[PDB]
Design a binder for this molecule. Structure first.
Ligand SMILES: Nc1ncnc2c1ncn2[C@@H]1O[C@H](COP(=O)(O)OP(=O)(O)OP(=O)(O)O)[C@@H](O)[C@H]1O
Ligand SMILES: Nc1ncnc2c1ncn2[C@@H]1O[C@H](COP(=O)(O)OP(=O)(O)OP(=O)(O)O)[C@@H](O)[C@H]1O
Ligand SMILES: C=C(C)CCOP(=O)(O)O
Ligand SMILES: C=C(C)CCOP(=O)(O)O
Lengths: 232, 238
């Protein structure tokens, strides 16, 4: 079994509100459709939740501004999600979105509906989303959070994160011409990296970070040729 | 105030003959009325051409096979697209909607609507819609917007339930087919009575709905404001 997250940095233009990279969505999903053991797909939001979230005070205390922002951020995320769902349906996949915003929550989310779908043969699709954290607070659960939950619940053999760079580097490669790709990380981007390292305890054969602009690399896992990072 | 739940029929917000064909002005016009309702607790909508068309063609509801399974994804996708048109209008007009789809709820014979209760309690207007669900290991179901309205009457005990369709109310026969049909304005549930399934379920609902279940022409949504009034045009079930 594989679980996989598509980063918002690769399927959206993060700098421009509600701006998708449709060709990246299509070319990633074309590859995802050939992965036989792919049981769950998560994606991030990029410019479809982070801009309105900041603008409306999410995550944060409930007030009439964040309450309206909650509606907008969730709606925007559905719009992005439907573009991923459309490409999956085109490739003959059997996707079904299960938003975090629709799950029971008591401090952790009741994912029973995603598990039921996996058992019935669907590929549940979920994404970084708003939720009601408590009677006076709205949270944002990111796609990395959801991936950590899914690792713990499913104990998949492999987890893949797609971002818009080749892997985890020593430093942000966009700022730092001298940054070096880290091919292999052991268990003994900072927030993302922490939770990936922590996922490895639930993922038998590796948590990978791969360039979503090179989705074909998912199939090079194991080969010399492989370009990417593995946490192992 | 009255606590109202309301269903927007697909017959009024879709062109039921033409696949994925919505009626945008009807949607905006209805939503303008909704945004002025003081205690609108819940909104449901049906699918018209964003559901019944594909569903029937894919064998939904029915046994699981690869056509109905792909069909499941597609019907749910299309339903979401229609729903988003409704959500977009509501957001444009100052409302706080949040979609809560039946296909994402736990089901064991009934649906666990807990997430929807949480949103009502938090001051949102949850919006749900007729949708696909896994009925058992071998079967896929379709839970219509009428079924969701029935679940909501019982769960929430609203004062009023309103169904919007593309005709004025229940007639003695199909109004579109025969020009001699007459509008039945008043249906006393205490008597034996002289869209069949819809009618059945509205009558069942009325025990959970304190002050009446109404059927109103969704092309005339201002009529919602004339509930109570002797000026109201529509069917009431009391
Ligand atoms: N050490 C590092 N290695 C690799 N990338 C880094 C590092 N530090 C910072 N970055 C930046 O992290 C970015 C990816 O982070 P980002 O949070 O956008 O990923 P994402 O999962 O696509 O986001 P989303 O939450 O929208 O899904 C890269 O574009 C890179 O510029
Ligand atoms: N006796 C009757 N009285 C009123 N309308 C009738 C009658 N018999 C048939 N109809 C037809 O019922 C239609 C509305 O029923 P319909 O099932 O479309 O409701 P709806 O809630 O809009 O559907 P959905 O929301 O499931 O897509 C009308 O267009 C009308 O032609
Ligand atoms: C709803 C928002 C803001 C997106 C959260 O998801 P991420 O994009 O994985 O951080
Ligand atoms: C999922 C489908 C087909 C819609 C069911 O809802 P209705 O249109 O209210 O009967």
């Amino acid at each position: 079994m594989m679980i996989l997250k598509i980063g918002g940095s690769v399927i959206t233009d993060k700098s421009a509100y509600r701006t998708a990279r449709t060709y990246a969505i299509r070319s990633i999903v074309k590859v995802l459709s050939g992965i036989e053991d792919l049981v769950c797909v998560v994606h991030g939001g990029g410019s479809f939740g982070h801009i309105k979230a900041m603008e409306f005070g999410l995550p944060g205390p409930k007030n009439p501004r964040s309450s309206i922002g909650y509606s907008i951020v969730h709606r925007d995320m559905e719009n992005l999600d439907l573009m991923v769902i459309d490409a999956m349906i085109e490739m003959g996949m059997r996707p079904i979105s299960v938003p975090i915003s629709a799950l029971r929550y008591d401090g952790r989310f009741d994912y029973t509906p995603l598990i039921r779908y996996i058992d019935a043969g669907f590929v549940p699709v979920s994404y970084g989303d708003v939720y009601i954290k408590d009677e006076h607070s709205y949270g944002i659960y990111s796609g990395d959070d959801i991936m950590a939950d899914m690792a713990e619940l499913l104990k998949p053999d492999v987890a893949v994160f797609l971002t818009d760079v080749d892997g985890i580097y020593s430093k942000d490669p966009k700022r730092n011409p001298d940054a070096v790709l880290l091919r292999d990380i052991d268990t003994n981007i900072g927030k993302k990296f922490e939770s990936m390292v922590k996922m490895k305890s639930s993922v038998k054969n590796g948590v990978y970070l791969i360039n979503g602009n090179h989705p074909e690399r998912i199939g090079d896992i194991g080969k010399e040729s492989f370009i990417g990072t593995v946490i192992r």
